[PDB]
């Protein structure tokens, strides 16, 4: 009549957070790019033909990017798959033989590269081979008359060249969840990260995210909505990595106007080293043209998202990076297979107050990189034949602030930070892993039998 009992239901809308293993899915088509392991697509499940979305009526739910422990899972996953695209290719520790160098076969107009001859063990163990290559000033180092050099990993590490078959363009992947877990998605547009969301939504898997190797500029990513949302885990500690999400994208049409020669060298048997041959005649430099007009408008798209952080009438300043490595002072991103570190000196430079052309960004080039900060494991990128070009939508920024400077006069803002679990997290902000608890108790007036 009133003595309420316990009643058992199943399939309830209840959850708590818990970390466990997610897994991959990258279409039924990306498994057909060949090239021997483009990233990780191997036995991953193909992706469903139609992904739909559900908006949770009345749900007010907490979201974050910081202690969202998928920010650690994805970095550890992208780390060990890098070896799997490497271990059946060509290692090159004997390339620590000395090269006799000189400024290149040029008509001056300068060098930054050299014409370096050296001896090497070929297919036959007894036969030695004469061959010279061309390297950038970052791939080698002089050791302590003309100048002679060594490869740069030699005073620290071993090194392995990847297969030139393996291509390296960012290809999308969906992150997955099985029977018991899911991934949340707060469909707020004006979303400053912290708090319950008014119209919480959900997804079973994420959208398509590309693991773009980039510091400073985010590329091939995801846009913002309404106002260019400014995001950060912590805006007070100037040691933290701050991530901006653009709304209006910018065209980067990078170019390496040097028809490059790929000289394959036999030093195996079977294996091969890939040297740099002649560049045809004229001598030009790798840049990265950027629409001057698009930058100036997008500056206001975020600077007017800074007057909402200090003053309805105020002032904002910029200056180039405070210093450090190329990965924190220069926009690094993959272009062709070789790498481009682009000069951020000429961008962070203006001064804001109250009431058709293009600049270009100088870019250095690197082929041997010690990425992941693994002292012991450097690599060599087999050079790209021909002129290199890469169009992409500019998407975000990894940057820092200064300290107090003069308290509230204004503040200088520079690029830096770098860390690779926060380049990833620039595309992990709107998700959080949850464990689903399906059993639910209620008190209804019914009771069972004996």
């Amino acid at each position, epitope marked *: 009549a009133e003595n309420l009992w316990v009643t058992v239901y199943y399939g309830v809308p209840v959850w708590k957070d818990a970390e466990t293993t997610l897994f991959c899915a990258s279409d039924a088509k990306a498994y057909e790019t060949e090239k021997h392991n483009v990233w990780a697509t191997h036995a991953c499940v193909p992706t469903d033909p139609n992904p739909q979305e559900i908006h949770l009526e009345n749900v007010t739910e907490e979201f974050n990017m*910081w*202690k969202n422990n998928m*920010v*650690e899972q994805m*970095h550890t996953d992208i780390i060990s798959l890098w070896d799997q695209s490497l271990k059946p290719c060509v290692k090159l520790t004997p390339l620590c033989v000395t090269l006799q160098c000189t400024n290149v076969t040029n008509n001056i107009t300068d060098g930054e590269l050299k014409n370096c001859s050296f001896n090497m063990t070929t297919e036959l163990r007894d036969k030695k081979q004469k061959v010279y290559s061309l390297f950038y000033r970052l791939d080698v180092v002089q050791i302590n008359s003309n100048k002679e050099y060594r490869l740069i990993n030699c*005073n*620290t*590490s071993a090194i392995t060249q990847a297969c030139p078959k393996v291509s390296f363009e960012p290809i999308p992947i969906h992150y997955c969840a099985p029977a018991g877990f899911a991934i949340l998605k707060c469909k707020d547009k004006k979303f400053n990260g912290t708090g319950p969301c008014p119209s919480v939504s959900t997804v079973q898997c994420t959208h398509g995210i590309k693991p773009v190797v980039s*510091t400073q500029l985010l590329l091939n990513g995801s846009l913002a909505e309404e106002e260019v949302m400014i995001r950060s885990e*912590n805006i007070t*500690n*100037n*040691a*933290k*990595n701050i991530l901006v999400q653009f709304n209006t994208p910018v065209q980067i049409n990078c170019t390496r106007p040097n028809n490059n020669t790929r000289k394959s060298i036999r030093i195996g048997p079977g294996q091969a080293f890939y040297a740099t041959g002649d560049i045809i005649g004229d001598i030009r430099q790798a840049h990265c043209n950027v629409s001057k007009a698009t930058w100036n408008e997008t500056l206001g798209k975020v600077v007017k998202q800074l007057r909402k952080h200090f003053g309805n009438n105020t002032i904002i300043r910029f200056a180039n990076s*405070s*210093g*450090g*490595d*190329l*990965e*924190v002072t220069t926009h690094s991103f993959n272009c062709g297979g070789e790498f481009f570190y682009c000069n951020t000196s000429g961008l962070f430079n203006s001064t804001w107050i109250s009431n058709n052309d293009s600049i270009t960004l100088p870019c250095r080039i690197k082929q041997i990189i*010690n990425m992941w*900060q693994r*002292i012991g494991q450097a690599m060599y990128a087999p050079p790209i034949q021909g002129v290199i070009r890469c169009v992409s939508n500019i998407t975000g920024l990894i940057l*820092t602030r*200064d*300290g*107090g*400077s*003069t*308290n509230s006069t204004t503040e*200088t803002f520079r690029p*830096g*930070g*770098g*860390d690779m*679990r926060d380049n990833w997290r620039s595309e992990l902000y709107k998700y959080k892993v949850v464990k689903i608890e399906p059993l639910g108790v209620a008190p209804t007036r019914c009771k069972r039998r004996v």
Partner: antibody
Amino acid sequence: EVQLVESGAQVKKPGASVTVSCTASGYKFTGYHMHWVRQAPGRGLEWMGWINPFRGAVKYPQNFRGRVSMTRDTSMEIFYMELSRLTSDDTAVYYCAREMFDSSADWSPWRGMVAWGQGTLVTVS
Amino acid sequence: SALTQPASVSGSPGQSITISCAGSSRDVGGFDLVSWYQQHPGKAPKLIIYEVNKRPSGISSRFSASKSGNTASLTISGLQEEDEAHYYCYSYADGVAFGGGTKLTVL
């Protein structure tokens, strides 16, 4: 054990610069923020700057921008540091110092001075 | 430095001491990020307390300090001749400012 090996006395002259070292030999380099700290003979100390050794994110107070240039060597594991526009007041010793909560994934802070070196004494006229 | 620390403090073995550390509406009174240190005369300096009052693993719990209102202060219980040293105050403020310093000695 760990250590912060510092250079011996490196006396230098005004209008120039000087190099002071903190060799690392026992702990993880990249993930551990490190500060340079200055101590004058019998006076108050000045916080100089710091670095994010993972690719070297350095910062200064506006006090010395244009003067100071500060960095490290990744695989040789050490901190160099220089301060330009020397004046005789700069006669002092120096100390490298680390922060508390450092790791791999989730960061913070900017505090908790634990580490100190050997006191590299330079002298300026 | 930006925190007024007094001139001197001296005593007899066994007593205890208090040292004030005052600023304005910005420094010690403005923020809860302080710390105090010890310098025995001529080696590597050492931290004793961080953040108002939380000891790090190892310091003998005769030392304890705090931050109240605007004047940070400290207290060392049962002075030994081991405690005869120089002492400071830290406080992250905008960047980092400091306390002037105060030495403890045996009378």
